[PDB]
Design a protein around this ligand. Structure first.
Ligand SMILES: NC(=O)C1=CN([C@@H]2O[C@H](COP(=O)(O)OP(=O)(O)OC[C@H]3O[C@@H](n4cnc5c(N)ncnc54)[C@H](OP(=O)(O)O)[C@@H]3O)[C@@H](O)[C@H]2O)C=CC1
Ligand SMILES: NC(=O)C1=CN([C@@H]2O[C@H](COP(=O)(O)OP(=O)(O)OC[C@H]3O[C@@H](n4cnc5c(N)ncnc54)[C@H](OP(=O)(O)O)[C@@H]3O)[C@@H](O)[C@H]2O)C=CC1
Ligand SMILES: NC(=O)C1=CN([C@@H]2O[C@H](COP(=O)(O)OP(=O)(O)OC[C@H]3O[C@@H](n4cnc5c(N)ncnc54)[C@H](OP(=O)(O)O)[C@@H]3O)[C@@H](O)[C@H]2O)C=CC1
Ligand SMILES: NC(=O)C1=CN([C@@H]2O[C@H](COP(=O)(O)OP(=O)(O)OC[C@H]3O[C@@H](n4cnc5c(N)ncnc54)[C@H](OP(=O)(O)O)[C@@H]3O)[C@@H](O)[C@H]2O)C=CC1
Ligand SMILES: [Zn+2]
Ligand SMILES: [Zn+2]
Ligand SMILES: [Zn+2]
Ligand SMILES: [Zn+2]
Lengths: 333, 333, 333, 333
């Protein structure tokens, strides 16, 4: 049997093509998913662009997705055909020091390898993943597909920031896929949350309904300093502001380098202020369960921008640069 | 009454001269100390050289000292005449947010101010300090005089590194005033400790006497990676090595910038490895008590190099640079 | 001046008499407050009844009050005449192990001595408290006066329960002075909050306005088990229920012994479930500032029942046992 | 193929017989182990006696053992024939909240089921265990065989006591299988360790070689209060001592109910002192790896007492009560 898929044999958004692919088949411990929705993320854009190398080639991208189990492989229990699932996107062995402490995204054995990057992903009608990565959910699958990358990454960032109730928390890029959940989880944890945006005027009512106590331009951020925590995955163009608005014991937490990876760090201010500069990536397997349950209970919300058919995958990827996008862009195969 | 003291009316090492000075008198809340031993540290050299503004001017430096109480001031209790004491050198208000959570070195009211920098210090026969800053001790005052700067700062770096039993801990600059205690505290917390030094041949048996499991040159440290924790206050010249040997979840802890303050921090590696880059300064007032108790009970050892009389203070501060020094330079007024 | 005051020269509520007393005067480090509101709590009742020895005799009770500074003592700066304040009620030295690590209610030197118990309290027009115990606030002093005992004790219980977002939290005695804030703080930390009441039908709409996700009868609590955290200051009559509904790694936190002090603890279920049974009392000096600012911000809400004048003080204390009460009972001198 | 085995078809020491039994064969995910040494614990005693129910019946006991992989079932990687292994004794699914957060001994799926209790155990020439439970080690298997019950359980008690360097930690029953390692771990975390024994004269030197700073009689212990931590798996006969010697913020941690499960708990002292009473059982799978490495590194030591052959399994079990015993009793099949 065969399937529709978006694939590229050489990198470049222009080489991403609708094709007819061989439908994959789950082996032991694997399930085959009929994909209902896949998110559109910087990660996916960058796999397509070649900035992140992929296997196998030619490659089907798509690391954030949800759908219905079509077939359980040999020996799979716990998930069965017809189950609506959402996929944890990190391959983990379950037996290394990192997996056994809960840090399955840091797996020493798989190298943190990511579904849709070191496997064929979900911009496709079907995808195979390990059964243990498929989390059964009763949530609307559009909303679920915003969880594996956006919500979970934001969760892990907020968890590693050690937010105490009443602490002031700035979220940089609060309008983005990660940010908009970063606002929510910082509020969940008791923070007073200041959402930072270069388009405050358009976005203020949205970010407040995400739970922001205040929306600030970058300039307003400077005056409102100091903050106890800055959650900022946007990279080096934000560094002078985000590093400079921290107070004593302030924690800068990043999981991305959107505008560049290299920053000039003043160790004298790092130690003079007792600041912590903290890396976060992906999220823990147990935390992904929590984030799913919280969506299902309505304690967090999914902000959707637009759903594209699989054939418009290119237009969908471009919509990531749209100055009007607030919310998640989805592909529906 | 007059006393001998090393003072400088204008910054610079050649401008540090022995003089006859007005003997200070303790106000309410203060104690007058007959200084027995003062430590010689980079902080003291930088005060005398002018990299740190000091007051009053002319200025008696000396931020790390121990001695005997000569007189208690109005309303002081708990500290009678002749009590041997060692002096916690941060001025703190005891009422601000930071003081009230225990981060007394971060006090918002005193500007973190340091005895012997914003007050006249211990390179003199007598000095005055707040009574709350004077810790009674039964320890040999030569050894007590290594605790306010070297031991306490190393204590506070180790504490903020979250050392678990069995984690691999590298100490860069391990031969120095801070590193020699950092080796000890890392072992005390149950780490497996790798002291790093450019003088391995000369210093190996001393760093083992301090509790190091292994003693490595910089190159050898690259081969022993990964490390869970790198205690390293040496600044930018060690950054590539120190940051490059960290494993997943690794903590870099710095309290200094000896060789340079600016480093190029790569956010991609920080988030991809979930590393934390952590600043540490001084130590908490309660932890200084603990450090003093640990010396009195023999759980940590002072490593001494030379004692100089107060007349030789120029020679004492130049010994900081000597490639034969391993251990603490003391001044005895 | 003379002032009015409730007072008892010998224990017993009938022997509590409105009198005219020597208006007290503030020494160094003290302030004299003009009490506007004072809360009524089991602690005030039990002090009046002789259960808790009081000093000095005859004694003015009243351990939770807010008002306006009448007169700064000598050397007191950082507060003015006419500044509205609310009183942190534990006396603390600021120099012991406990004070320096932030646990000022555990002070080794005052023994945790309480204002209105070891000093003349705020069931009176004026009272003298240490200046450092007096917190400036811009909130309604009626609501402020619910914080020194009710909110702060609840905060410290929730803080010591280690609530993660999504954990299930039961609050026994949610209708009371402590419970009504424990519901709120548990929600602030991201818990799913189940308030348990013996009078669900009457109080349910109130406890939901305090933030409870559900209100439960004791039988319904049994059916909703397991719970991650149980905040329960009610003592032994609630023990079998609260301890029995805990799940794996569950935490029982109490600050009270309302219905009895002794419980039969099954060590085999404690270890087999890895449960923690945790004590909590009072609150930290720094957290009191956080509770004040959270009231000022609107993030917590005070629930008031009735305000009595100093004349009807015995009726106000008798209102504690009133089975219709939900909220705080204030005395207004 | 047949093997030798100690087995009982009805509970009671007298019913434990040496038998010839069918040699077990490993299925998928399992390894067969030629047992070289197995520990003798109260747990194995109570299984043979009937206080702990077991399956299957008739039953081979033995929950703490090490040996050599003889065969691997289908699809087993990471463990091979010839590997010298020590067996983590909790069965764990690896997919539930407890497992994915690292608390494998609390698995919701297996109930925390223990090898040799719900499976055939190690009092035999061969046993089958899950491959993921077999930890290859370079230690002497005689010493490894003291880790699965004695060492790991102590580790997990110490872990859950949150021992700060310098804190006073009491170990009740320090002479026992668990206590002899608890002493060690408390010292490695930086505690000042007071070992408690009813036979101090007889055992003082041994406990001091395990790392105890002082050895105390029960009466000496009351006089040496307060302690910050009491590690005590001995149950109710020690409760008044252990609970009563705690200071402010003290932690009582238990993993056992040796002398009785029921204790009368004064909630009012619990909260007035902010004590935590903490259950601990087994240990985490990740910590078990940490414990084996510490043994391989000499940072902890095995205190052996006697090694019996399989046929003497009765006298080895009876050897648990020998008032001379200090050390592990072992069986060697
Ligand atoms: N480690 C991991 O597992 C993951 C890493 N990431 C990384 O995190 C980063 C963000 O991802 P995501 O939230 O989806 O990104 P989005 O593009 O959805 O959001 C980024 C937001 O940042 C702001 N922004 C964009 N450009 C700039 C700029 N030049 N200067 C200042 N602000 C800017 C915009 O907000 P506005 O216009 O309102 O100001 C924008 O909405 C990326 O680098 C991504 O690779 C993401 C997911 C997971
Ligand atoms: N924040 C605070 O409260 C405090 C901060 N500090 C700061 O910490 C830093 C260290 O102080 P201290 O321990 O007294 O310093 P020391 O000079 O006593 O020790 C520093 C050690 O670093 C090593 N070192 C020197 N230069 C280099 C280099 N180019 N590359 C690699 N290693 C080098 C040397 O070890 P070797 O030759 O064996 O390799 C030396 O022994 C200073 O910057 C000081 O200002 C110090 C005390 C308190
Ligand atoms: N350590 C400290 O600093 C402090 C300690 N405390 C202590 O905490 C405890 C509670 O204080 P507070 O909130 O002021 O008390 P309240 O009486 O105001 O509230 C107690 C609540 O518990 C429930 N309850 C009352 N009696 C019983 C009973 N007989 N059996 C079962 N449930 C009952 C009731 O709720 P419902 O009827 O709806 O079920 C009642 O509203 C007291 O023991 C007090 O002494 C209080 C403040 C500070
Ligand atoms: N939860 C879990 O995963 C585990 C739980 N356990 C439980 O922990 C408990 C202790 O185990 P273990 O160390 O093997 O036991 P041991 O008998 O080996 O040691 C107990 C020690 O306590 C002291 N003691 C013994 N009896 C009494 C008594 N009658 N009164 C006062 N002190 C006494 C003795 O020390 P001395 O004579 O020197 O005073 C003795 O050496 C047991 O109940 C066991 O079942 C054990 C392992 C794992
Ligand atoms: Zn792994
Ligand atoms: Zn301060
Ligand atoms: Zn105190
Ligand atoms: Zn499990």
């Amino acid at each position: 049997h065969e399937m529709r898929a978006a694939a590229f044999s050489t990198p470049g958004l222009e080489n991403l093509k609708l094709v007819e692919a061989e439908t994959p088949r789950p082996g032991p411990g694997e399930v085959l998913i009929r994909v209902k929705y896949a998110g559109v993320n910087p990660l996916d854009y960058n796999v397509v662009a070649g900035a992140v190398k992929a296997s196998p080639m030619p490659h089907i991208p798509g690391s954030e997705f949800a759908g219905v189990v079509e077939e359980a492989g040999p020996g799979v229990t716990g998930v069965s055909r017809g189950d609506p699932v959402v996929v944890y996107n990190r391959l983990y062995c379950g037996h290394c020091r990192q997996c056994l402490t809960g840090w399955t995204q840091m797996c020493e054995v798989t190298g943190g390898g990511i579904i849709g990057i070191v496997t064929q992903g979900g911009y496709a009608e079907y995808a195979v993943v390990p059964a243990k990565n498929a989390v059964a959910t009763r949530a609307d699958l559009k909303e679920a597909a915003t969880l594996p990358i956006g919500a979970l990454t934001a969760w892990n960032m907020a968890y590693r920031a050690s937010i105490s109730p009443g602490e002031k928390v700035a979220v940089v890029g609060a309008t983005g896929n990660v940010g908009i959940y970063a606002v929510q989880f910082a509020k969940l944890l008791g923070g007073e949350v200041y959402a930072i945006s270069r388009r405050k005027a358009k976005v203020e009512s949205i970010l407040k309904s995400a739970g922001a106590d205040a929306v600030l331009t970058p300039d307003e951020a400077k005056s409102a300093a100091p903050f106890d925590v800055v959650l900022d995955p946007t990279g080096s163009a934000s560094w002078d502001l985000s590093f400079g608005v921290l107070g004593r014991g302030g924690r800068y937490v990043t999981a991305g380098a959107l505008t560049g990876a290299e920053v000039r760090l003043d160790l004298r201010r790092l130690y003079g202020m007792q600041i912590l500069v903290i890396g976060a990536t992906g999220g823990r397997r147990a935390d992904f369960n929590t984030v799913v349950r919280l969506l299902e209970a309505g304690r967090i919300k999914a902000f959707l921008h637009n759903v594209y058919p699989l054939a418009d995958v290119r237009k969908a990827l471009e919509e990531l640069r749209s100055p009007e996008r607030v919310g998640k862009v989805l592909i529906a195969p």
